[PDB]
Amino acid sequence: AVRIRLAKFGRKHHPIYRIVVMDAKYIDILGTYDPKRKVLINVYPEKVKEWVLKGVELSHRAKAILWNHGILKEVVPEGYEMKRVGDYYVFEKRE
Predict the structure, then answer these.
(1) PANTHER family from the xrefs?
(2) SS (H, E, C) the chain
(3) Which of 40, 54, 63, 77 could form a disulfide with 58 if both were Cys (CB 3.0 to 4.6 A apart)?
């Protein structure tokens, strides 16, 4: 399926992860994350609103980054709920 997940980028002792949209290059890049310093180097919030509200599945850690860094809070409207589905997370309309 099309999912939001992490892809390796960078070097030994300094790993870097792109948050990407891919089907299992990439469909879209949602941002760039540094796990050691715990910062988002780049983020593209218009891209994350689009894909997340499309019901695309997020990996646990892609969800964690975007939630903790308040990216989800700025872009996901009330009336959309996050659901935990197996290994993934999805946002969908309440009703």
Answers:
(1) 30S RIBOSOMAL PROTEIN S16, SMALL RIBOSOMAL SUBUNIT PROTEIN BS16M
(2) CEEEEEEEEEECCEEEEEEEEEECCCCEEEEEEECCCCEEEEECHHHHHHHHHCCCEEEHHHHHHHHHCCHHHHHCCCCEEEEEECCEEEEEECC
(3) 63
Stated in angstroms to one decimal place, the resolution of this structure is 2.0
**Do the Cβ atoms of 76 and 53 come closer than 8 Å?**
yes
Among 74, 92, 76, 72, residue whose Cα is nearest residue 84: 92
Token reading at 43: 């983020």
CA distances to 49, 63, 68 from 93, in Å:
14, 18, 22
Please report where in the chains the tokens 């996901």 appear, as a residue.
76
- The CATH class of the 1-95 domain is alpha beta
Give the type of residue at 15: P
